[PDB]
Write a protein that binds this ligand. Structure first.
Ligand SMILES: OCC#Cc1ccc(O[C@H]2O[C@H](CO)[C@@H](O)[C@H](O)[C@@H]2O)cc1
Ligand SMILES: OCC#Cc1ccc(O[C@H]2O[C@H](CO)[C@@H](O)[C@H](O)[C@@H]2O)cc1
Ligand code: NI
Ligand code: NI
Lengths: 158, 158
């Protein structure tokens, strides 16, 4: 089991850490949502699916920088929604193919009501998402840690 | 099969990730190349050359930060040249000795016409190069992920 990012990098068997740079809507008004869809960015696969089932959770999601201070939101993982920053590990999603498949994580973020002007700075860390991978085969229990960065400023107009 | 960097770190049998810092020409004009030769830094060896042949490709090369935004380039891998960021996995290089041999990868980067001022920041991630290793012996298929960082600022004069 290993993962890769779009036009990007890989975190190999055994886990590790990587940076993911995402383009964000440049303007988001109070009452609109900023959507950070990692399912187009992070892809994973099972290396021996004919005998091994891989189990993958979002063990934890935390907010940083402008997202931490100026937005509130939720995280959607494989079709269910949870608080973000997270309060517990999600249910497992099964990976059972050698073909790269999306990690089905998306953040749905909305400006706090007093936010105005530059709410997220270009180049800044906005989130850390920990993918936890286990299996039905051995004692493997690995973390794949994704540091998520904004490529551009996001402005909340006034 | 494992790899190390000169005065540096190691990625052991089975693959993994490591960080590599490179010195860059401090001033580079439109129409000139920054040459980043990793073959003097990254070295690999075969752990059982008497019965095993190791096959090593450049699986993917990706650009980040100032290189992604301010440069275009190519990669030379074992005597052939390709676009960088890459568009496919290269042909293989054979490793058949216990003696350290260079991984023969070099990047040639040239500023785009909008580059001006500090086009690459000191300390910043500039590229990821993924070495994929297999053999003629078993099912081993491992990735060695090299994160390339700039040691110094590179300026594009205006
Ligand atoms: O002889 C035939 C074979 C084989 C094979 C054995 C283990 C293995 O582990 C990785 O791939 C597994 C499956 O994706 C993971 O569950 C492990 O955590 C680990 O990443 C992958 C392939
Ligand atoms: O009885 C003596 C023996 C033996 C032996 C079997 C496998 C092996 O794998 C490593 O070294 C091999 C050769 O470098 C690699 O192809 C593998 O992927 C792995 O890194 C090394 C030695
Ligand atoms: Ni694989
Ligand atoms: Ni060795």
């Amino acid at each position: 089991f290993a993962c890769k990012t779009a036009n990007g990098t890989a975190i190999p068997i055994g886990g590790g850490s990587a940076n993911v740079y995402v383009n964000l809507a440049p303007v988001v008004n109070v009452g609109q949502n900023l959507v950070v869809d990692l399912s187009t960015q992070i892809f994973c696969h099972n290396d021996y699916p004919e005998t091994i089932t891989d189990y993958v959770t979002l063990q934890r999601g935390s907010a940083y920088g402008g997202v931490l201070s100026n937005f509130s939101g939720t995280v959607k993982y494989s079709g269910s929604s949870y608080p973000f920053p997270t309060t517990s590990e999600t249910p497992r999603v099964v990976y059972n193919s050698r073909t790269d498949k999306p990690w089905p994580v998306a953040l749905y973020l909305t400006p706090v009501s007093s936010a105005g002007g530059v709410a997220i700075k270009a180049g800044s860390l906005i989130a850390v998402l920990i993918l936890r991978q286990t299996n039905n085969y051995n004692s493997d229990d690995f973390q794949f840690v994704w540091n998520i960065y904004a490529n551009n400023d996001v402005v909340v107009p006034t």
